[PDB]
């Protein structure tokens, strides 16, 4: 059934599973027309499909041409997401197909379920967690490749860089969500925090800085502080 705080440790067993997030699939600036009406202009989007155990991220870039001459785009975006996920699954070898696909938003169950009818033994699950994957675009390396795209394109990343060489997937996923929640709540402060020290570089094949174990602790501390501050501002607590 639904994924929540209790069964959280199942993300990290050896049953292959994928998180799918569709928040940045269909993206628009809203602007005024010459006549004073409101109109939208789409930009390139993406499907964020993540193995929480390995860090393998499958970034399906959704080029704006896909919406051309279509109506009800927000609804179609959901079906497009399920078509692209389902084709990812078909594309993978059998022993690599997921046993479970957990969607971040419940409106994707029916689309994915319909597209996955050929895979009856793959379970499509909702989640009660409020995961911050929509901040995946605050990530310049990903933002940049999305925006530059001239056609549809799959790009493969490890969203945990080399972290698993030193820490467990549980801990890596917790760091990842803490970084993304901070990016979501206050992007400016969050990116200030990671580059504060110009001597800590980003490897070309990495989207996080090469912190030592000790600097990650300090980093994670600073991100927790940031989130908590923002929250008091939000509610006046």
């Amino acid at each position: 059934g639904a994924m929540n705080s209790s069964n959280y440790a199942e993300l990290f067993n050896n049953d292959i599973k994928l998180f799918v997030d569709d928040t940045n699939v269909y993206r628009v600036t809203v602007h005024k027309t010459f006549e004073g009406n409101v109109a939208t202009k789409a930009i390139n989007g993406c499907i964020f499909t993540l193995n929480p155990k390995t860090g393998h991220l499958f970034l399906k870039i959704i080029h704006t041409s896909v919406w051309a001459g279509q109506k009800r785009l927000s609804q179609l975006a959901k079906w497009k997401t399920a078509e692209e996920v389902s084709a990812l699954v078909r594309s993978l070898p059998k022993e690599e197909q997921p046993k479970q696909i957990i969607v971040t938003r419940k409106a994707m169950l029916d689309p994915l379920e319909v597209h996955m009818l050929d895979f009856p033994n793959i379970a499509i699950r909702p989640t009660e967690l409020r995961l911050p994957f929509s901040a995946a675009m605050s990530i310049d390396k990903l933002s940049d490749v999305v925006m530059k795209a001239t056609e549809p394109q799959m790009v493969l990343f490890n969203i945990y860089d080399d972290w698993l060489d030193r820490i467990s997937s549980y801990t890596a996923f917790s760091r990842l969500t803490l970084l993304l929640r901070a990016l979501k709540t206050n992007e400016e402060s969050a990116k200030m925090i990671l580059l504060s020290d110009p001597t800590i570089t980003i490897k070309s094949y990495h989207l996080w800085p090469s912190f030592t174990d000790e600097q990650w602790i300090t980093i994670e501390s600073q991100m927790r502080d940031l989130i908590l501050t923002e929250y008091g501002r939000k509610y006046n607590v």
Binding site: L76, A82, E83, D110, E113, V114, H115, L117, D118
Partner: protein, 300 residues
């Protein structure tokens, strides 16, 4: 006009014949039902004074033979049976009438309710849903489950309605995933009407028979099935004009006939609000919509 005799009434029971129902006392001299109108199916059903669980009954068509009722004290229920000796059967019926031990099927001349509920219901189709081929008549009860219900346990006692599943390969063409899920006209017209049911009359008959079993026996899977077939039309953007007009009439008399106190379990809020207000056919059920609003505005 045909007759169904009863050998005896040994236990206290409420007896229904179509939408009429009489209370019968333990060992009251009740010997059957007369003036039953020829030309429609019918249903005779029972609810024992002592066990208000398990409504049970028999569907039948008197053109298909002479039928009577007889209590069985071993199995504890009023059983339907066929009498093959024509002379022996007229003789029984005539003697009972002479003694006036029979109630009269109480039809009002102005009244087309029964016709309107059973328009497309045909005894041969019923006998394919309730497969018991040594009998010309069909038993149903509260507790029988549907073939689809069993898929998610005894086959001989199941109700073999046509399986409808909006999220199946059957309903969903590969490559038209979004299209067919949002607009079931493919599934309705090609798969169900043309492929399985063959015509709208058979579809409509199954729908009417589902409804009547949900209403008379409280058979829940029959209720699921009725709602499913309404939902399949209502969610199709392309439906023959004649079918839409006929559905409004069908549902109208179904909603008219439902006992007021049962709207809570027998009517599926989600299906009706979607059909009447969200679906492609939201504007095609004017009489159904008008009666639902003036009689059950709460559900909506």
């Amino acid at each position: 006009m045909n007759t169904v005799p009863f050998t005896s009434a040994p236990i206290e029971v409420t007896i229904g014949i179509d939408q009429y129902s009489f209370n019968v006392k333990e060992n009251q001299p009740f010997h059957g039902i007369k003036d039953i109108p020829i030309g429609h199916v019918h249903v005779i059903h029972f609810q024992h004074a002592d066990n208000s669980s398990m409504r049970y009954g028999y569907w039948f068509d008197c053109r298909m033979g002479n039928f009577y009722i007889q209590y069985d004290p071993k199995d504890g229920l009023y059983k339907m049976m066929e009498e093959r000796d024509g002379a022996k059967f007229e003789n029984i019926v005539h003697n009972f009438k002479e003694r006036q031990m029979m109630v009269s099927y109480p039809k009002i001349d102005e009244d087309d309710t029964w016709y309107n509920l059973t328009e497309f219901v045909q005894m041969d189709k019923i006998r394919k849903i309730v497969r018991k081929d040594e009998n010309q008549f069909s038993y149903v009860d509260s507790s029988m489950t549907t073939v689809q219900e069993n898929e998610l346990s005894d086959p001989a006692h199941s109700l073999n309605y046509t399986v409808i599943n909006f999220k199946s390969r059957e309903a969903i063409r590969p490559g038209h995933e979004m299209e067919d899920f949002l607009d079931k006209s493919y599934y309705l017209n090609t798969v169900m009407l043309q492929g399985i049911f063959k015509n709208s009359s058979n579809y409509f008959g199954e729908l009417q028979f589902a409804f009547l079993n949900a209403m008379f026996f409280g058979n829940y899977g029959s209720s699921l099935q009725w709602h499913a077939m309404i939902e399949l039309i209502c969610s199709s953007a392309t439906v023959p004009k004649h079918m839409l007009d006929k559905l409004d009439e069908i549902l109208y008399y179904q909603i008219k006939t439902l006992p007021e106190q049962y709207s809570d379990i027998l009517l599926n809020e989600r299906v009706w609000n979607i059909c009447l207000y969200s679906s492609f056919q939201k504007n095609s059920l004017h009489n159904t919509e008008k009666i639902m609003e003036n009689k059950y505005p709460e559900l909506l």
